[PDB]
Amino acid sequence: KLKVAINGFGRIGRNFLRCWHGRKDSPLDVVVINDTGGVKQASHLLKYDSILGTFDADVKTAGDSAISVDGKVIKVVSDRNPVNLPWGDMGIDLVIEGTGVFVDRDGAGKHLQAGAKKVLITAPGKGDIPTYVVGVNEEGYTHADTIISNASCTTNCLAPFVKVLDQKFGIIKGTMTTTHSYTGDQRLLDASHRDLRRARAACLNIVPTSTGAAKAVALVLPNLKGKLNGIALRVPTPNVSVVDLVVQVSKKTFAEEVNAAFRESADNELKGILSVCDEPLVSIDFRCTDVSSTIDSSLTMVMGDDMVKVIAWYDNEWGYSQRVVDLADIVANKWQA
Amino acid sequence: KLKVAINGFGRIGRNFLRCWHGRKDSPLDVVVINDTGGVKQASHLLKYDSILGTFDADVKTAGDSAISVDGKVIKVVSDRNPVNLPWGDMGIDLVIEGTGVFVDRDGAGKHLQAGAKKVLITAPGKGDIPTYVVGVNEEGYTHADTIISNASCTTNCLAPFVKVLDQKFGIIKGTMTTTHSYTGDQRLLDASHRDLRRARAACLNIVPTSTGAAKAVALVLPNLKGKLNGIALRVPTPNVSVVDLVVQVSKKTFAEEVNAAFRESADNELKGILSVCDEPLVSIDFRCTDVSSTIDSSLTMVMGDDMVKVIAWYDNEWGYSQRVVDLADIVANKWQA
Amino acid sequence: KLKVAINGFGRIGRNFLRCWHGRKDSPLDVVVVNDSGGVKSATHLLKYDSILGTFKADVKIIDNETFSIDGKPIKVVSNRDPLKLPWAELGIDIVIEGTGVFVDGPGAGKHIQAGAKKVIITAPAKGSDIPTYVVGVNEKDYGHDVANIISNASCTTNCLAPFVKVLDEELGIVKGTMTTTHSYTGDQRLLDASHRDLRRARAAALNIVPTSTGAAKAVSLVLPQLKGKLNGIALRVPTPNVSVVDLVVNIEKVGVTAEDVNNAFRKAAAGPLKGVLDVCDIPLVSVDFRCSDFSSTIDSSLTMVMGGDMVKVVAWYDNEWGYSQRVVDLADLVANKWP
Amino acid sequence: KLKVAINGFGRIGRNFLRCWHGRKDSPLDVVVVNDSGGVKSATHLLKYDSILGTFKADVKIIDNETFSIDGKPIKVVSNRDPLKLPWAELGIDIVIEGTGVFVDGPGAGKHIQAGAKKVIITAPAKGSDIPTYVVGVNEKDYGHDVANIISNASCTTNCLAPFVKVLDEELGIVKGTMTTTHSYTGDQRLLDASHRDLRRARAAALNIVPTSTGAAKAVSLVLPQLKGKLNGIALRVPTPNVSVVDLVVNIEKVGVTAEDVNNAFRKAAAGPLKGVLDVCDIPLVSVDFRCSDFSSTIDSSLTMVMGGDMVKVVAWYDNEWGYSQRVVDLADLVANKWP
Numbered sequence A, B: 001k002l003k004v005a006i007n008g009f010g011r012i013g014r015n016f017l018r019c020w021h022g023r024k025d026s027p028l029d030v031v032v033i034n035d036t037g038g039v040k041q042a043s044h045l046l047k048y049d050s051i052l053g054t055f056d057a058d059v060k061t062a063g064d065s066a067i068s069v070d071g072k073v074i075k076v077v078s079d080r081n082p083v084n085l086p087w088g089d090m091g092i093d094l095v096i097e098g099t100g101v102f103v104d105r106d107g108a109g110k111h112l113q114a115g116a117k118k119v120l121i122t123a124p125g126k127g128d129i130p131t132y133v134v135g136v137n138e139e140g141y142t143h144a145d146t147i148i149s150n151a152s153c154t155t156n157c158l159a160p161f162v163k164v165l166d167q168k169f170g171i172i173k174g175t176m177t178t179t180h181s182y183t184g185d186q187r188l189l190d191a192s193h194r195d196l197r198r199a200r201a202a203c204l205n206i207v208p209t210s211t212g213a214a215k216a217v218a219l220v221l222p223n224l225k226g227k228l229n230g231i232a233l234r235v236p237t238p239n240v241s242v243v244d245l246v247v248q249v250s251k252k253t254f255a256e257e258v259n260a261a262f263r264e265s266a267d268n269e270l271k272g273i274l275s276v277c278d279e280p281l282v283s284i285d286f287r288c289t290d291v292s293s294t295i296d297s298s299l300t301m302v303m304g305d306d307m308v309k310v311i312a313w314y315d316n317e318w319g320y321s322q323r324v325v326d327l328a329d330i331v332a333n334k335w336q337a
Numbered sequence C, D: 001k002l003k004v005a006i007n008g009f010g011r012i013g014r015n016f017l018r019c020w021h022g023r024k025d026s027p028l029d030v031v032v033v034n035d036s037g038g039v040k041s042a043t044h045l046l047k048y049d050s051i052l053g054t055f056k057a058d059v060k061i062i063d064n065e066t067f068s069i070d071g072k073p074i075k076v077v078s079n080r081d082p083l084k085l086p087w088a089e090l091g092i093d094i095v096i097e098g099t100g101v102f103v104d105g106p107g108a109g110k111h112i113q114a115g116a117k118k119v120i121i122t123a124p125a126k127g128s129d130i131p132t133y134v135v136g137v138n139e140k141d142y143g144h145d146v147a148n149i150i151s152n153a154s155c156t157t158n159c160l161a162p163f164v165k166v167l168d169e170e171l172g173i174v175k176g177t178m179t180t181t182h183s184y185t186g187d188q189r190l191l192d193a194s195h196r197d198l199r200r201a202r203a204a205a206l207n208i209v210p211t212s213t214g215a216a217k218a219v220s221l222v223l224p225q226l227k228g229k230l231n232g233i234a235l236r237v238p239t240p241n242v243s244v245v246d247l248v249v250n251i252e253k254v255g256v257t258a259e260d261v262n263n264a265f266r267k268a269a270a271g272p273l274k275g276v277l278d279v280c281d282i283p284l285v286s287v288d289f290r291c292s293d294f295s296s297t298i299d300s301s302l303t304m305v306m307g308g309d310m311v312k313v314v315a316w317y318d319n320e321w322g323y324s325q326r327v328v329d330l331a332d333l334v335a336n337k338w339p
């Protein structure tokens, strides 16, 4: 219903719109997309995922500048500058930075200059930029929050339940890492890049790196300041990743209890946000899964009743896309205008 | 010099003999090999690694039942039963279980029945079976230790330096995991196996699993009883792996100091056993590396001056093979007979 | 509507059962599974696919000899012995060789002795005693009591046979030698390991593998007018699964375009070989055909001509999914040929 | 012994410099590198290869505009502007296009205006104005001041050209249409991403890619007697880095065996095309040829005949390593052709 716009049409926005069309009563409405690619090119592209596969809905280029989605036409634009983009023209309520380049307040500001109402970001807002997360700060979302972001799917996976865990026993501290799958942030072959690791081919190489999660959790949970500083392991898969973490909780306990509380939360509020998996399952067993998190209760363990190893997966985009969905819906909430 | 024999000629024994021929003054001498495969088949096989590549030495089937190594002929046998194997025939001093099936005392005992002097094992001795590790228990090796094993390369990587770390600050506890690469222990495609995870194709799928390391370290270090219980992550690479671990040490400190002590140890005794890597490096940057361990001092960190995240790599076989080499040499040591 | 039992629950059989439950009105009743792997594992295995994923419906485990799917229960056996399978007890009309073991007639007849009515081989019979029946090819030429144990060679073959037949039929093909791009399989070695064929013995995930395929014969088998007309070798790509082949042939026509043929291609594919055959036009790559019931999908922008008659062709197939459907509808025909 | 500067430090240029320092008596002096990537990174990049690994000797970084290798220092530039490269200052005789950008003559001549003496294109010239010189092919036919900016098409081409030439030479080839198995490269998309060609635009690591190659023309370019004689399309395997092709051709001979040819194959490969060409006999797979200086390696057990003259052939090559060596010895010849 609400007029939406996506920008920097990465696989992120692709899966995103795939969910949006697949979304049951999407209260939102994307109307245009920007990315360097072309109309039929992008249409073909999105028409076939390399993980889900083809789109279970005809998408043709309805017009040479727009594409249909079973008749649902959406304008396709291509530029590297938000001011060149029909925000005030199309009266765009919301632009979605997928380029990853407008990690600044200013970057989003360009869209507002071209006539954007609000700007949301799939990336960790580089600098003092708010990021709302379902079951986390989503209530802190105000309509005054016109410029807010979303950190890496990795982060968002961790945030809520580890919050509850600090709320369950009280996590004194504990750092992590993630089996993160590679991406465009890592050059296909060994090509020059800001990060040598990211510069590496890595198609056949595990990449050690980091993520703002180490602080993004402290970001979303100022309470969690410094209690965790985890790094990122870009793994040679293209897919959904799982996360490692051992924490130091204040209250002593056993893993199974933590797992039970996990299920409980995945019923009370983490329902739909979180799942608890107990079967022997691997990355394949978590695809197109809408719960941001899949607790491997079957394997989570605790050392000294305080040092709590945990296993839970998260889809590189699909789950993240769903996060984008419902946060955008929350934006449609508190949307008197 | 000492007459050696290898059994179950997995890629393990392949890389092993590749090092042995490449070994500078190998005081040992393999004379025969068993594995289900055939003579020219295996010769061709070993002649070309999929990681190092071809063998930098002509190997032909010197005889229809044996193969040369630049003229160094070694008998090739093929059977599933040690009693069918020329131990008392060839007067074999030592058989090397590579089959992984004789994880029992009894399994090795079969070779001794066919006339083996001692039996060494590339695998974690399933049950009460001694495993010696360089710089770890290798001194505890006695000539009376005729039946001793060697746990997974993963384990052996961890043991020595974490020992020193408990010897450096005093590791109260702390569990781990490893970016272990898949193997034959996991079915190429989704084929039936004892472990569903191991049963999984996993060619494109990270596998969560475990390893005796969680106890093998407590095994080799009874002092380390329960101080660590780490799991295994079989990653979709075929290659050298790296290890994750955060520990709880008694003495407070900072990572850089730990790294320095790491270098120091990799000079005093962990020299050749261990390296300290500070450059941004990935699995490719650790192949044919003889130090069992490559400390990523550049990335190791500590939480609360006690919770010590660490990064260090280990070659699936090559390094492990080297471990086999020098332990076998130690067997040639204390070898009055 | 007719008793069936899979003999060997290969990934092939997994996809097969996927299609069977995914079948509209499957005239056949797969009731018991053979694989020495434990029912809980099995249920897991099929319940968690790699190439496409979890069964898109429930699977449960009734008594751990005999699990269920969406309430519909399925027996399971677990053996390598043919006679030790309750073909007689379970009254199974048809054996589904999902092991490739009994590439011999006698090996299959063993299960018949164990009380089976018929056997189908989901593979090329190493002998010749067994009719390697193919959809759109000899499926019509199948007869009941006419070697009630019939065979079915590799997808590789089946993908190629029918349309190239139609090609030498409408246009006439002098000869030709194909070459596919097969995706690694269990016979290949995830890592260099003890194995007969030196090639697939290597670490599969990291090596294209030069091998051959019985197809070049199987096609001449099913097409005796193709006897010694086709050769071609199997290229085994370290990709999960996205079978695809190319072949240049000398046509017996005047030397016509390839375009016109692509027209005729899709025509027959839209004509007698509806559903069986596809000739797509969109420029697409491997993943662009996952889980496609078409035994083959040609793209026109690929197939071309060298010397008028020297003409090239490209098309794709899923070594199981399509092959699975092939098993399905042949058995269904068999069921029609069944009394 | 002659000034050189790589223009664009592609992985190609990385392997190239590996060979250059790995060269016995390289008559050429690569002194400065072009790539807008920072010298510390560069040093790292070359110092840490994937396909084979770290330089098997020291590499250091003297002043971070200008690093070193084993004491031997190397300047570096970092730009996309041709004129902004000190070809004139550094007095560089030869430009090594390692970007594929200036597939045009003029694009290369830009660097000449920036003070270069000659340009070589490590790629197929999109135009035709540039001599796509090839070892064992037209390398002898190269002349100084004869378009001192000459080109060199893909390894793909160069692998095929010379020996197939010798084949139509000793036996005569009517025609034929090849098809390779190229491995993904930077032009391909690690993940489905905005890109011109729909095919290589897809996630490379998980898709065989149907594409074509300028080779079928380049061969006709270098072999005008092959004008319109060869076609063939590029198959892009998500393989790490191993290049290999097949092709069936109709010979102009009586219809001889393939065996005899394999003999003649290795003969010429051992004859005029020593080092350049290989015809191996061991049944081998992709990895079995890593870092092999042979522009091509045939395996006899593969190449075959369909119709006497309808004859198949298989051989391999490293898209860079061999190609690198090609760049090396051509420049060395150029150096001999140099005053």
Ligand SMILES: NC(=O)c1ccc[n+]([C@@H]2O[C@H](COP(=O)([O-])OP(=O)(O)OC[C@H]3O[C@@H](n4cnc5c(N)ncnc54)[C@H](O)[C@@H]3O)[C@@H](O)[C@H]2O)c1
Binding pocket: A007, A008, A009, A010, A011, A012, A013, A034, A035, A036, A079, A080, A081, A097, A098, A099, A100, A101, A122, A123, A124, A151, A152, A153, A154, A183, A184, A185, A316, A317, A320, D192, D193, D194
């Ligand atoms: N890998 C994931 O699924 C994932 C998960 C977490 C966060 N993210 C975020 O998603 C973004 C990357 O998306 P992706 O992983 O699909 O990669 P991607 O490279 O496919 O996305 C970027 C796309 O935008 C285009 N683009 C770049 N700069 C542009 C500009 N100035 N204007 C217009 N288009 C431009 C690129 O050409 C490309 O098509 C980043 O913001 C990243 O932080 C990605």
Ligand SMILES: NC(=O)c1ccc[n+]([C@@H]2O[C@H](COP(=O)([O-])OP(=O)(O)OC[C@H]3O[C@@H](n4cnc5c(N)ncnc54)[C@H](O)[C@@H]3O)[C@@H](O)[C@H]2O)c1
Binding pocket: B007, B008, B009, B010, B011, B012, B013, B034, B035, B036, B037, B079, B080, B081, B097, B098, B099, B100, B101, B122, B123, B124, B151, B152, B153, B154, B182, B183, B184, B185, B316, B317, B320, C192, C193, C194
């Ligand atoms: N991935 C590794 O390199 C690694 C890590 C640590 C330890 N190990 C140990 O190495 C062994 C596996 O070696 P691999 O990883 O090279 O796998 P592998 O499967 O290649 O090794 C087993 C080999 O032995 C053969 N074999 C099996 N049973 C046999 C029998 N009864 N008699 C004779 N031959 C037999 C198999 O056919 C195969 O060739 C196990 O014991 C494992 O614990 C391997």
Ligand SMILES: NC(=O)c1ccc[n+]([C@@H]2O[C@H](COP(=O)([O-])OP(=O)(O)OC[C@H]3O[C@@H](n4cnc5c(N)ncnc54)[C@H](O)[C@@H]3O)[C@@H](O)[C@H]2O)c1
Binding pocket: B189, B190, B191, B192, C007, C008, C009, C010, C011, C012, C013, C034, C035, C036, C079, C080, C081, C098, C099, C100, C101, C122, C123, C124, C153, C154, C155, C156, C185, C186, C187, C319, C320, C323
């Ligand atoms: N790969 C394909 O798509 C394809 C196409 C054509 C032909 N085939 C034929 O299908 C066979 C199996 O297909 P796959 O690729 O899934 O192979 P697979 O090895 O995965 O299937 C065999 C399965 O059955 C088990 N098994 C082996 N022998 C058995 C026996 N005697 N009784 C019961 N179970 C037994 C194996 O342990 C394994 O679990 C191959 O051997 C091949 O001849 C397969």
Ligand SMILES: NC(=O)c1ccc[n+]([C@@H]2O[C@H](COP(=O)([O-])OP(=O)(O)OC[C@H]3O[C@@H](n4cnc5c(N)ncnc54)[C@H](O)[C@@H]3O)[C@@H](O)[C@H]2O)c1
Binding pocket: A189, A190, A191, A192, D007, D008, D009, D010, D011, D012, D013, D034, D035, D036, D079, D080, D081, D098, D099, D100, D101, D122, D123, D124, D153, D154, D155, D156, D185, D186, D187, D319, D320, D323
């Ligand atoms: N892949 C092969 O083996 C092969 C074989 C034949 C032809 N080629 C040609 O070689 C070119 C590069 O080879 P590659 O596969 O290593 O590609 P690549 O993209 O890895 O190499 C180009 C590198 O140079 C940089 N670059 C791009 N434009 C530049 C410019 N104008 N000035 C300076 N640096 C620039 C890129 O950012 C990248 O780091 C290709 O474009 C292709 O035309 C390569």
